[PDB]
């Protein structure tokens, strides 16, 4: 009821559960790829693996 104090008011809840297994990705952040430079040393990130 709308007469209730906040401890007795309804709350909606969403729980995002994540896994990055010893297996590939299927969900990613908005971040954008760049060119694969082979045969030089690079700072790198593959599927979030920095």
């Amino acid at each position: 009821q709308p007469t209730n104090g906040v401890g007795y008011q309804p709350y909606r809840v969403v729980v995002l559960s994540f896994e990055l297994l010893h297996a590939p990705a299927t969900v990613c952040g908005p971040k954008k790829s760049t060119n694969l430079v082979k045969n030089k040393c690079v700072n790198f990130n593959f599927n979030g693996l920095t």
């Binding site: 297994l21 010893h22 297996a23 590939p24």
Partner: peptide, 24 residues
């Protein structure tokens, strides 16, 4: 009736490459 499995039914435990190594 039954049969002995011997050393059958093993599989790759994870999608990880490993070589020239023993892994537990």
């Amino acid at each position: 009736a039954y049969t002995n499995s011997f050393t059958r039914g093993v599989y790759y435990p994870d999608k990880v490459f490993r070589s020239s190594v023993l892994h537990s």
